[PDB]
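Internal ticket - ligand job 281, sodium ion:
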Amino acid sequence: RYSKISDNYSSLLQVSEALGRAGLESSNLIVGIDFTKSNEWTGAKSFNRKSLHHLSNTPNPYEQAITIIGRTLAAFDEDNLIPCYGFGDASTHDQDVFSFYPEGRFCNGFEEVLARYREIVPQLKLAGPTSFAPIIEMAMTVVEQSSGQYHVLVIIADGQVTRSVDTEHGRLSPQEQKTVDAIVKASTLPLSIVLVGVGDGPWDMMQEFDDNIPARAFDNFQFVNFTEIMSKNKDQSRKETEFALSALMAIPPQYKATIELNLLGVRNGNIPQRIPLPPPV
Ligand SMILES: [Mg+2]
Ligand code: NA
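stdout (structure tokens):
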């Protein structure tokens, strides 16, 4: 499906213009980066046995994903300010996020996101386990504080939410329970959630994850497998557009939904204010 579309897009500019014609207007970007220790070994097949956070003169999957999503959504960003958070390191585990800059200062453009990412990475202690509840809750807080302006949260992660040891008897882990609850609660806000999977995974349980999310007023969640798309044997510029479209083509209908539901521009009033920890640097 997305492959059939992207075959006719030669640049990210074309993808951006398409999102514009599909109804996307002023749109804000929030980025959450997975800093769990698993990043050390999930690059086995996908990244030459290097850490997914390994820095060099070639961008790692995080930098690549940021660049592609950043370039595509930049035209819709009126203030060009991108709240950025890390999670899954030793300072946050599955309980918190930390802001890329002290006092929660937003990054100025995706270029600064990239630069500041490279500054922070070598000073982190990677940990775990994996939950997306703190980063989704942080996004909720930002949306509410902005008085209900539309946001797209892009989570870039190298694993699914941590499962229960007793998952085979139908039990959810706290990480799963709180993450699913956050996804549902987020649908009461003008917020779209995109989970970008990098590394080896496994990612084969995501469609079933998606299928089991409880009923929401609109479908506010998308998973996209960066690795699978960028591993294809086809043109590089064409892999980029396919990724951008796969990650973002559902955003304009979601945006339209936040308008039809009258979520846009209003404060919900039931959003706990999550505080981001300082960057542990
Ligand atoms: Mg991980
Ligand atoms: Na913005």
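Auto-summary: Residues 28, 77, 79, 81 surround sodium ion (ligand 2) (CB under 6 Å). The chain has ten helices and eight strands.
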